[PDB]
């Protein structure tokens with residue numbers, strides 16, 4: 001459906017265009033390796049950014065929620081942005097995947113495996129010196145019909161990517177026990193890495209198809 | 225001139241509208257001799273062709289047939305929802321005369 | 328000559344600017360008989376054709392009509408905001424003469 | 430006329446169907462004289478050409494060769510899974526006659 | 533043969549480079565008679581045309597003029613950064629001889 | 636027939652392979668008279684051209700030079716890795732004869 005997610009970020013829309021989206025730490029381009037771990041990502045301390053370490057960038061379920069987290073982290077900024085983001089299968093309810101071991105349950109946050117591509121970003125509010133601006137700038141790269149026909153990933157697709165250490169009791173409990181990568185509970189850390197790499201490969205295939213087919217829809221054969 | 229695909233389809237004999245409201249399930253393309261055509265399906269089984277050009281087409285149709293093969297290839301790919309196809313029901317499969325795309 | 332779509336509209340008889348500032352709601356395309364054309368609508372109901380190539384068109388327009396149908400199709404399939412259409416209002420629906428996007 | 434790539438292939442001598450269900454790993458095109466062609470491969474080594482236009486092609490296939498090379502370039506850059514290829518097995522690489530893509 | 537756009541421009545009279553390093557702000561095309569042309573603008577207010585095909589062009593330019601309007605169109609639609617534009621300053625608006633694109 | 640780009644180049648005396656494994660850093664095309672060409676560069680400074688159509692080219696290469704320009708543009712905009720280029724090295728910059736793409 002057409003639900004949105006929200007994220008405060010210091011990086012302006014100029015930089016996001018060039019980066020192919022809002023990236024994780026260390027990732028420079030969307031389609032360009034790096035640790036991909038959901039458990040390590042949600043535990044990570046926020047140092048000037050809303051959580052974007054270990055392969056994921058984090059979001060908020062509402063505008064109000066994104067703005068309060070933006071004032072805890074990026075209060076110093078004379079100009080930061082709140083990005084409006086479409087829900088899609090690159091995205092994961094962190095409280096549902098990690099379950100009882102969700103590090104910050106009150107935050108109610110949703111994290112994109114591999115960053116949020118540019119075309120998934122609906123738009124952005126500017127936030128001049130603490131104050132949210134009413135006007136919503138709309139991203140030209142956004143594709144409403146595509147992303148309004150997609151939702152977040154279900155927790156069932158995320159239980160195997162949860163990324164707990166092999167000695168963690170989560171792997172011998174439900175629902176994670178039936179989804180454990182070989183070597184986890186009863187080579188785990190390398191097997192969750194490679195499952196995360198394949199997941200991002202197959203999601204990247206899906207956004208390339210939508211965006212790069214749009215770019216080649218001008219072709220006319222009959223004119224030589 | 226018709227304002228829509230339905231009025232356009234009424235101006236032709238041996239013809240009929242299909243309401244799909246769905247993206248294309250499959251795209252098929254051929255350069256084999258006498259079989260230079262496109263074939264599309266949808267999830268519910270319904271199959272359609274862009275005809276091989278022949279004596280039945282007038283000269284001004286030739287540019288639009290090739291245009292129509294472009295539209296279908298790239299509508300398949302962008303997963304674009306096709307509202308309707310006006311087709312000729314005296315061929316097997318039914319042959320496309322027009323397409324509309326919406327929502 | 329002209330540096331914008333509004334000024335280019337002022338050079339021709341039977342034309343008017345339509346200001347949409349909106350992406351195309353639908354794209355129709357026909358290879359049928361004497362209706363080798365494209366029609367587009369918007370959310371407000373407004374409808375526009377790219378005309379069947381005919382005796383109203385000089386030979387340099389032939390290629391430009393094929394380009395306009397290429398342009399409308401990619402604008403639709405990328406959701407590009409179209410700013411204006413200069414059209415000919417003495418035909419039904421209004422025949423696109425030009426397009427701008429900002 | 431045929432409703433799908435399999436039944437279409439069987440109309441021609443020296444053809445087989447290839448079931449890839451996979452994106453193209455490489456695209457290669459040439460403008461060099463007498464080698465005006467394309468080549469695609471898949472990850473573990475399957476290879477396919479679109480042939481140089483020549484005396485083995487009737488007039489109506491010439492427009493369709495140009496299109497097929499476009500189709501494969503688009504599929505390559507979009508990482509779109511290809512379902513099948515009908516091919517002539519009497520050329521090396523196997524010369525593509527048709528292509529289907531599902532999903 | 534030149535290694536870049538700056539040098540291409542130096543081979544012609546009445547030309548000049550414009551270093552923009554920005555996306556096209558607006559794209560405009562016309563199919564009106566005697567006005568079969570494209571006009572692009574930028575945020576800084578600069579306006580450029582691709583000229584109407586006429587007697588100032590030799591035959592080998594016709595396909596390159598059509599090509600340039602295609603290039604200007606997807607550059608606009610993808611928000612592609614244009615590095616430079618070679619243009620003729622004996623036309624108003626200045627007419628595009630060449631484009632170059634980079635980060 | 637060549638089975639890959641490396642084979643294609645060894646069929647001509649006056650060519651070589653460059654291995655880039657890198658996307659195009661800049662794309663440049665011109666409509667100016669007698670310079671209707673394209674020019675790409677990579678970040679290492681390597682420059683390449685799609686030659687102006689001429690008397691070195693036979694008729695079947697004409698369509699293929701236009702394909703190559705299409706290919707370089709869309710490759711540049713999608714940031715697709717270029718694997719190899721077959722090129723004629725009796726010209727500066729080296730003229731493209733073929734291109735392969737792969738990650």
Ligand SMILES: OC[C@H]1O[C@@H](O)[C@H](O)[C@@H](O)[C@H]1O
Pocket residue numbers: 238275280281282285312314315319359360
């Ligand atoms: O324009 C093509 C059409 O021509 C008609 O005359 C024929 O009856 C149709 O089946 C269709 O082929």
Ligand SMILES: OC[C@H]1O[C@@H](O)[C@H](O)[C@@H](O)[C@H]1O
Pocket residue numbers: 341378383384385415417418422564565
């Ligand atoms: O150049 C084409 C135009 O010609 C005009 O004379 C006519 O009013 C319009 O119908 C339009 O088609």
Ligand SMILES: OC[C@H]1O[C@@H](O)[C@H](O)[C@@H](O)[C@H]1O
Pocket residue numbers: 256257443480485486487490517519520524
């Ligand atoms: O239509 C072209 C085909 O023609 C056949 O005669 C030939 O055996 C095939 O390899 C293929 O080239």
Ligand SMILES: OC[C@H]1O[C@@H](O)[C@H](O)[C@@H](O)[C@H]1O
Pocket residue numbers: 546583588589593620622623627666667668
């Ligand atoms: O390629 C066409 C060009 O021809 C030149 O002679 C003229 O000065 C330019 O303004 C431009 O029109």
Ligand SMILES: OC[C@H]1O[C@@H](O)[C@H](O)[C@@H](O)[C@H]1O
Pocket residue numbers: 461462649686691692696723725726730
């Ligand atoms: O296909 C074009 C090529 O033709 C070759 O025979 C010539 O030696 C090369 O310099 C190149 O121009």
Ligand code: NA
Pocket residue numbers: 001002003086087088147148149150151
């Ligand atoms: Na959504």
